[PDB]
Coordinates of N, CA, C and O in Angstrom, one line a residue:
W1 N 71.8 129.7 113.7 CA 71.9 128.5 112.8 C 70.6 128.2 112.1 O 69.5 128.4 112.7
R2 N 70.6 127.8 110.9 CA 69.4 127.5 110.1 C 69.1 126.0 110.1 O 69.8 125.2 110.5
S3 N 67.9 125.8 109.6 CA 67.3 124.4 109.6 C 68.2 123.5 108.8 O 68.5 122.4 109.2
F4 N 68.6 123.9 107.6 CA 69.4 123.0 106.7 C 70.8 122.8 107.4 O 71.3 121.7 107.3
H5 N 71.4 123.8 108.0 CA 72.7 123.6 108.6 C 72.6 122.7 109.8 O 73.4 121.8 109.9
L6 N 71.5 122.8 110.6 CA 71.4 121.8 111.7 C 71.1 120.4 111.2 O 71.5 119.4 111.7
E7 N 70.3 120.3 110.1 CA 70.0 119.0 109.5 C 71.3 118.3 109.0 O 71.5 117.1 109.1
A8 N 72.2 119.1 108.3 CA 73.5 118.6 107.9 C 74.4 118.2 109.0 O 75.1 117.2 109.0
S9 N 74.4 119.0 110.1 CA 75.1 118.6 111.3 C 74.7 117.3 111.9 O 75.5 116.5 112.3
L10 N 73.3 117.1 111.9 CA 72.8 115.9 112.4 C 73.1 114.7 111.5 O 73.3 113.6 111.9
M11 N 73.1 115.0 110.2 CA 73.5 114.0 109.2 C 74.9 113.5 109.5 O 75.1 112.3 109.5
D12 N 75.8 114.4 109.7 CA 77.2 114.0 110.0 C 77.3 113.3 111.3 O 78.1 112.3 111.5
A13 N 76.5 113.8 112.3 CA 76.5 113.2 113.6 C 75.9 111.8 113.7 O 76.1 111.1 114.6
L14 N 75.1 111.5 112.7 CA 74.6 110.1 112.6 C 75.5 109.2 111.7 O 75.6 108.0 112.0
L15 N 76.2 109.8 110.7 CA 77.1 109.0 109.9 C 78.3 108.6 110.8 O 78.8 107.4 110.8
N16 N 78.8 109.5 111.6 CA 79.9 109.2 112.6 C 79.3 109.1 114.0 O 78.2 109.6 114.2
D17 N 80.1 108.5 114.9 CA 79.6 108.3 116.2 C 79.3 109.6 117.0 O 78.2 110.0 117.2
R18 N 80.4 110.3 117.3 CA 80.4 111.6 118.0 C 79.2 111.8 119.0 O 78.4 112.7 118.7
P19 N 79.1 111.0 120.0 CA 77.9 111.0 120.8 C 77.7 112.3 121.5 O 76.5 112.7 121.8
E20 N 78.8 113.0 121.9 CA 78.6 114.3 122.5 C 77.9 115.3 121.6 O 77.0 116.1 121.9
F21 N 78.4 115.3 120.3 CA 77.8 116.2 119.3 C 76.3 115.8 119.1 O 75.4 116.6 118.9
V22 N 76.0 114.5 119.0 CA 74.6 114.0 118.9 C 73.8 114.5 120.1 O 72.7 115.1 119.9
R23 N 74.3 114.4 121.3 CA 73.6 114.8 122.5 C 73.3 116.3 122.4 O 72.2 116.7 122.7
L24 N 74.3 117.1 122.1 CA 74.1 118.6 122.0 C 73.1 118.9 120.9 O 72.2 119.8 121.1
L25 N 73.2 118.2 119.8 CA 72.3 118.6 118.7 C 70.8 118.3 119.0 O 70.0 119.2 118.9
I26 N 70.5 117.1 119.5 CA 69.1 116.9 119.9 C 68.7 117.7 121.1 O 67.5 118.1 121.3
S27 N 69.6 118.0 122.1 CA 69.3 118.8 123.2 C 68.9 120.2 122.8 O 67.9 120.8 123.3
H28 N 69.6 120.8 121.8 CA 69.2 122.1 121.3 C 67.9 122.1 120.5 O 67.3 123.2 120.3
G29 N 67.5 120.9 119.9 CA 66.2 120.8 119.3 C 66.3 120.8 117.7 O 66.9 121.6 117.1
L30 N 65.7 119.7 117.2 CA 65.7 119.6 115.7 C 64.3 119.4 115.2 O 63.3 119.6 116.0
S31 N 64.1 119.2 113.9 CA 62.7 119.0 113.4 C 62.1 117.7 113.7 O 61.0 117.6 114.2
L32 N 62.8 116.6 113.3 CA 62.4 115.2 113.5 C 61.1 114.9 112.7 O 60.6 113.8 112.8
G33 N 60.6 115.8 112.0 CA 59.5 115.6 111.1 C 59.8 115.7 109.7 O 59.2 115.1 108.8
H34 N 60.8 116.5 109.3 CA 61.4 116.6 108.0 C 62.7 116.0 107.9 O 63.3 116.0 106.8
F35 N 63.3 115.5 109.0 CA 64.6 114.9 108.9 C 64.6 113.4 108.6 O 65.6 112.8 108.3
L36 N 63.4 112.8 108.5 CA 63.2 111.4 108.3 C 62.6 111.1 107.0 O 61.7 110.2 106.9
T37 N 63.0 111.8 105.9 CA 62.5 111.5 104.6 C 63.1 110.1 104.1 O 64.1 109.7 104.6
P38 N 62.4 109.4 103.2 CA 62.9 108.1 102.7 C 64.3 108.2 102.1 O 65.1 107.2 102.3
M39 N 64.7 109.3 101.5 CA 66.0 109.4 100.9 C 67.1 109.5 102.0 O 68.1 108.8 101.9
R40 N 66.8 110.2 103.1 CA 67.7 110.3 104.2 C 67.8 108.9 104.9 O 68.9 108.4 105.2
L41 N 66.6 108.2 105.1 CA 66.7 106.9 105.6 C 67.5 106.0 104.7 O 68.2 105.1 105.2
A42 N 67.5 106.2 103.4 CA 68.3 105.4 102.5 C 69.8 105.6 102.7 O 70.5 104.6 102.8
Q43 N 70.3 106.9 102.9 CA 71.7 107.0 103.1 C 72.1 106.6 104.5 O 73.2 106.2 104.7
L44 N 71.2 106.7 105.5 CA 71.5 106.1 106.8 C 71.7 104.6 106.7 O 72.6 104.1 107.3
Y45 N 70.8 103.9 106.0 CA 71.0 102.5 105.8 C 72.2 102.1 105.0 O 72.8 101.1 105.3
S46 N 72.6 103.0 104.1 CA 73.8 102.7 103.2 C 75.1 102.9 104.0 O 76.1 102.5 103.4
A47 N 75.0 103.4 105.2 CA 76.3 103.6 106.0 C 76.9 102.4 106.6 O 77.9 102.5 107.2
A48 N 76.2 101.2 106.5 CA 76.7 100.0 107.1 C 78.0 99.6 106.4 O 78.2 99.8 105.2
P49 N 79.0 99.1 107.2 CA 80.2 98.7 106.6 C 80.1 97.5 105.7 O 79.2 96.6 105.8
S50 N 80.9 97.5 104.6 CA 80.8 96.4 103.6 C 81.2 95.0 104.3 O 80.5 94.0 104.0

């Protein structure tokens, strides 16, 4: 698996709950240094229900 594929998987795992997927993703290891760009923070904040 590549960096962008894992980043997209973590993106979906943050948009939706899926705690087991979240657990496995961070357990396997991510960047956490390039995953926190302001644009990504923006779509994370935009996920709040209306």
